[PDB]
């Protein structure tokens, strides 16, 4: 009969289990026998206190490196301000030791945990690539709670080496099953930032994870976008509880906050899932998240039902992760078919945007060809356009099944005149739909100003398969 952890702060880990049903349903996975044994997770951040009394028992030097100083030891740099505490806090959420009289527990409290010290220095493309590409046949899951500036005006993503690291990771990592990259969706809510303007979260190769407050609301720091896949609990207002984890200087904190806490919790749930089925591919894992995540009692004004009956929100993706459901569904999961890619060049001439532009195109999604897609995964609208004030633009994409994805909401602080240069806006909201039929792209000026520009390229890129659909929800 499963015995829950006895750790002194475990009763404060409201998001792991509770009578109330506002939790990630992790105890149900633990009781099925899954606590992370044999799974290796690495935190890409400012280091990891490998001697922390709640991390040492699970620490894995093979999951760790110091890219900033080029040595094997990711110990954080200690300063009076304790600036380099972030990675240690993330690590404890994944894999803090259980039943040891110290602080609380990780989601995957028997997994092995490492850290890559890579933020405490100049974060070049090469630094990112050496981190994402660290020991890819040993590390299973990478967790990153960082990215481009959340000022609400930046459009930035992985440069060449980092993108190569993603492609190498998902292709050859983990024995050819693919490295699992978990990403926090961002803290730019106060700036009205969009997580589709962040190429790390907007990547198909990352599971981008947003946050919900204890009372089920969209936190102040949350960024809305169509690339987000799912949600875990994190912090909110000062009446709402926060995240309990390991802190720098061998301490315990009950006040870890922001989307930085959501990616590690997701990484821990994914670790339990991979223990339940070690043969899952990187795409299998995203399918499991889509099928098992739960909207219930997350509050948002944009919940919509997609073409296969699943509720989806730009604040939450498919909803809260459900660890018990993930490990249950993983056990007898049938590997998905190989990924197909259908490239559709939409325009026959440039189109002036003006106040409003609508582009309609009926597609066959590579009918008659080996890359025919009847079951969508990710879809991208790769757009090249000029505009005099980028943040006045709002962009929507409507699928043949009627699912309206917001690719870009207005960004009041984005005064850029640089437009978008083949930017691959991504949506998860049409997952499992048939992409044959009419797609609609809408570009609108949300301001009263007499703005101007031109759309010169629109590539619709469809990923997916042609077999295996479920009856719609």
């Amino acid at each position: 009969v499963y015995q829950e952890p006895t750790d002194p702060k475990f009763p404060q880990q409201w998001y792991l289990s509770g009578v109330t049903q506002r939790d990630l349903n992790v105890k149900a996975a633990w009781a099925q026998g899954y606590t992370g044994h044999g799974i290796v997770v690495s935190i890409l951040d400012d280091g990891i206190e490998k001697n922390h009394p709640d991390l040492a028992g699970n620490y894995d030097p093979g999951a760790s490196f110091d890219v900033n100083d080029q040595d094997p030891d990711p110990q954080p740099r200690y300063t009076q301000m304790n600036d380099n505490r972030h990675g240690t806090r993330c690590a404890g959420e994944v894999a803090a030791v259980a039943n040891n009289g110290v602080c609380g527990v990780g989601v995957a409290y028997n997994a092995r945990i490492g850290g890559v010290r890579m933020l405490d220095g100049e974060v070049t493309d090469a630094v990112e690539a050496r981190s994402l590409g660290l020991n890819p046949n040993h590390i299973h899951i990478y967790s990153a709670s960082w990215g481009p500036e959340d000022d609400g005006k930046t459009v930035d993503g992985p440069a060449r080496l980092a993108e190569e690291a993603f492609f190498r990771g998902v292709s050859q990592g983990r024995g050819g099953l693919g490295s699992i990259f978990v990403w926090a969706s961002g803290n730019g809510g106060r700036e009205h930032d969009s997580c589709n303007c962040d190429g790390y979260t907007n990547s198909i190769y990352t599971l981008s994870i947003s946050s919900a407050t204890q009372f089920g609301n969209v936190p102040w720091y949350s960024e809305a976008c169509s690339s987000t896949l799912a949600t875990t609990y994190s912090s909110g207002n000062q009446n709402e509880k926060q995240i309990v984890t390991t802190d720098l200087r061998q301490k315990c904190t009950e006040s870890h906050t922001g989307t930085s806490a959501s990616a590690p919790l997701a990484a821990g749930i994914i670790a339990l899932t991979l223990e339940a089925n070690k043969n899952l591919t990187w795409r299998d894992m995203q399918h499991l998240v889509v099928q098992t995540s739960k909207p219930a009692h997350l509050n948002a004004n944009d919940w919509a039902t997609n073409g296969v009956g699943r509720k989806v929100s730009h604040s939450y993706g498919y909803g809260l992760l459900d660890a018990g459901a993930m490990v249950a569904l993983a056990q007898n999961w049938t590997t998905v078919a190989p990924q197909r890619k259908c490239i559709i060049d939409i325009l026959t001439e440039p189109k002036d945007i003006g106040k409003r532009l609508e582009v309609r195109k009926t597609v066959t999604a590579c009918l008659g060809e080996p890359n025919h897609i009847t079951r969508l995964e990710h879809a991208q609208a790769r757009l090249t356009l000029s505009y005099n004030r980028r943040g006045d633009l709002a962009i929507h994409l409507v699928s043949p099944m009627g699912t309206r994805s917001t690719l870009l909401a207005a960004r009041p602080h984005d005064y850029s005149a640089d437009g978008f240069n083949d930017w691959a806006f991504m949506t998860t909201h049409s997952w499992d739909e048939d992409p044959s039929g009419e797609w609609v792209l809408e570009i609108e000026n949300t301001s009263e100003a007499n703005n101007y520009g031109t759309l010169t390229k629109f590539t619709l890129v469809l990923y997916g398969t042609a077999s295996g659909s479920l009856v719609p929800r």
Partner: peptide
């Protein structure tokens, strides 16, 4: 850039 989160 790259900011913590």
């Amino acid at each position: 850039x790259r900011v913590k989160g």
